[PDB]
Amino acid sequence: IKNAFYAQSGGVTAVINASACGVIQTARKHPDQIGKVYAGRNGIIGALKEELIDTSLESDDAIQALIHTPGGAFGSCRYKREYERLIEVFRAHDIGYFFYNGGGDSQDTAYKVSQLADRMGYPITCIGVPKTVDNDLPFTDCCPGFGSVAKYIATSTLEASLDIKSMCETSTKVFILEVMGRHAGWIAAAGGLAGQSEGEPPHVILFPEIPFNREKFLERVDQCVRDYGYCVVVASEGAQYERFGVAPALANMVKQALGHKYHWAVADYLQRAARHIASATDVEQAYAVGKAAVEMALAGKQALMPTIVRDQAKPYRWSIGEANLSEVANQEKKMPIHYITDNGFGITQDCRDYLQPLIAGESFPPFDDGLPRVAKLKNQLVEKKLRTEFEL
């Protein structure tokens, strides 16, 4: 029970590989407690199909590269007997450590593995590493990955705004930028960090937490174009009533109803892969939770998820705390309404106090020939052992 198994889960992030780096590098700093670090090819599917990547065959440099490369270096999946097969392949490979890096579902399943492992007489210390661009995990200040998209959305909103503002007298006067966020508006909220007073961008932020009042929307925008000269709205894909992609939908609304020239963009995967403008504090934290999960497992702790704790709002200070996987599931983290302005289309000062520090600092990745440098892993498989196995 000396090797460790690391796997990613759910949608990838611009810094989820930073976590992988934090976990892998510290594991290598304890050869007397942990042997090889195996990575699940394409997530737990990898463990299930017994496709284990031997990350020990990877040079220190490559591993170091992980902190400035987006996506999932080993691959991920959204996949949610199976538990029995996980322990069968873990013990066959001397795996006593299970580091599961993902959203809520992941944390829960990590816990269950822990339960079955004991039951079957095969303890395996399982520590989950937080990961969510939606920032909806509980018992943590922020979720690794969000800080970076927040910075991206805020920057993108600020830049597009300066553009529109430049020619709103002649050309387009309404710009809509559709961002991620189906049930949570944390991402859309980051857009408000672009402007700090009233009259400056973004004029409208569509939160999925606030039902869409077409009449209130159409009149706020119209009011903006003829007061400030233009209007930029940051709408999350989760715009709903009690849906609507969204960008073009609203654009059509303003056109047929206000006649203003519009423009829209849809960042999609761009926002969660923009490692070029990642948040330093975010990649810093992505690394830390990975290191702390390997440390908690060394200290002999069990079934925990590392956390980020805000030890100080003023001059923002943070550190890593702990949380019981057992309770991570069936809790979540909803965006507190007192974060949204009464207009329903704005962020409040309490929300700025929370976000602003999260996007602090820049962690530009190194650049080679004009482009960002990326990992480049061997990702070689270990020699099978079991006798095959199908999934659902």
Q: What residues are designated binding site?
A: 11, 132-134, 180-182, 237, 269-272
Any contact of residue 32 with a copy of itself (CB under 8 A)?
no
Q: Which does 103 bind (CB under 5 to 8 A by kind): a copy of itself, Na ion, none?
A: Na ion
Per the annotation, the verdict on 108 as an active-site residue is no
Tell me whether residue 28 is exposed, middle or buried, using C-beta atoms within 10 angstroms of its C-beta: 0 to 12, 13 to 18, 19 or more.
Answer: middle
Which member of 10, 75, 185, 346 binds Na ion (CB under 5 A)?
A: 10
Q: Which does 361 bind (CB under 5 to 8 A by kind): a copy of itself, Na ion, none?
A: a copy of itself
Are 253 and 244 in contact by the 8 Å Cβ rule? The answer is no
Q: Which does 267 bind (CB under 5 to 8 A by kind): a copy of itself, Na ion, none?
A: a copy of itself
Q: Nearest CA to 4 among 296, 216, 231?
A: 296
Marked catalytic residue, from 108, 134, 136, 282? 134
Specify the residue, 274 or 304, whose C-beta has the smaller distance to a copy of itself: 274
- Per-residue string for binding with Na ion, 76-105, x by CB under 5 A? ---------------------------x--
User: Which residues within the stretch 275-334 sit at the binding site for a copy of itself (CB under 8 A)?
Assistant: 275-277, 279
**At residue 128, what are phi and psi to the nearest 5 degrees?**
-90, 145
Specify the residue, 10 or 144, whose C-beta has the smaller distance to Na ion: 10
Q: Which does 68 bind (CB under 5 to 8 A by kind): a copy of itself, Na ion, none?
A: none
Specify the residue, 24 or 34, whose C-beta has the smaller distance to a copy of itself: 24
User: Binding site for diphosphate: what residues are annotated?
Assistant: 11
Shortest approach of Na ion to residue 10 CB, angstroms?
3
Token couple for 77? 């999946």
Which member of 116, 218, 253, 273 binds a copy of itself (CB under 8 A)?
A: 273
Are 11 and 72 in contact by the 8 Å Cβ rule? The answer is no
How many residues line the site for a copy of itself (CB under 8 A)?
A: 64
- Per-residue string for binding with a copy of itself, 373-392, x by CB under 8 A? -x------------------
User: Which residues within the stretch 124-153 sit at the binding site for a copy of itself (CB under 8 A)?
Assistant: 151
Specify the residue, 90 or 264, whose C-beta has the smaller distance to a copy of itself: 264
**Cβ neighbours of 277 (radius 10 Å):** 17
**At residue 279, what are phi and psi to the nearest 5 degrees?**
-95, 130
Q: Which does 162 bind (CB under 5 to 8 A by kind): a copy of itself, Na ion, none?
A: a copy of itself
Which region, judged by CB under 8 A, interacts with a copy of itself, from 65-73, 102-110, 112-120, 181-189? 65-73
Strand 304-312 and strand 317-324: the pairing is antiparallel
Which member of 7, 193, 225, 303 binds a copy of itself (CB under 8 A)?
A: 193
Tell me whether residue 250 is exposed, middle or buried, using C-beta atoms within 10 angstroms of its C-beta: 0 to 12, 13 to 18, 19 or more.
Answer: buried
Which region, judged by CB under 5 A, interacts with Na ion, from 11-19, 41-49, 200-208, 234-242? 11-19
Strand 3-8 and strand 231-236: the pairing is unpaired
Hey, CA dihedral for 280, 283, 285, 288, is it positive or negative? Answer: negative
Alpha-carbon gap, residue 193 to 343, rounded angstroms:
17
Are 3 and 97 in contact by the 8 Å Cβ rule? The answer is yes
Give the list of residues 6+ apart from residue 239 with CB closer than 8 angstroms, or none.
206, 208, 212, 246, 250
Any contact of residue 12 with a copy of itself (CB under 8 A)?
yes
Which region, judged by CB under 8 A, interacts with a copy of itself, from 22-30, 158-166, 214-222, 236-244? 158-166
Q: Nearest CA to 188 among 80, 388, 67, 340?
A: 340
Alpha-carbon gap, residue 181 to 58, rounded angstroms:
35
Specify which residues 235 forms β-bridges with. 178, 206
Q: What is the secondary structure of 6-73 as a DSSP string?
A: EEE-SS--SSHHHHHHHHHHHHTT-TTT---EEEETTTHHHHHTT-EEEGGGS-HHHHHHGGG--S-T
Distances (CA, A) of 102 to 15, 40, 224: 12, 13, 41
Specify the residue, 137 or 303, whose C-beta has the smaller distance to Na ion: 137
Binding site residues, Na ion, CB under 5 A: 10-11, 103
Q: Looking at the annotation, which residues are catalytic? A: 134
Binding site for a copy of itself (CB under 8 A): 11-12, 14, 42-43, 45, 69-73, 75-79, 151, 154-156, 158-160, 162-167, 169-171, 175, 177, 193-194, 247, 263-270, 272-277, 279, 356, 359-362, 364, 367, 369-372, 374
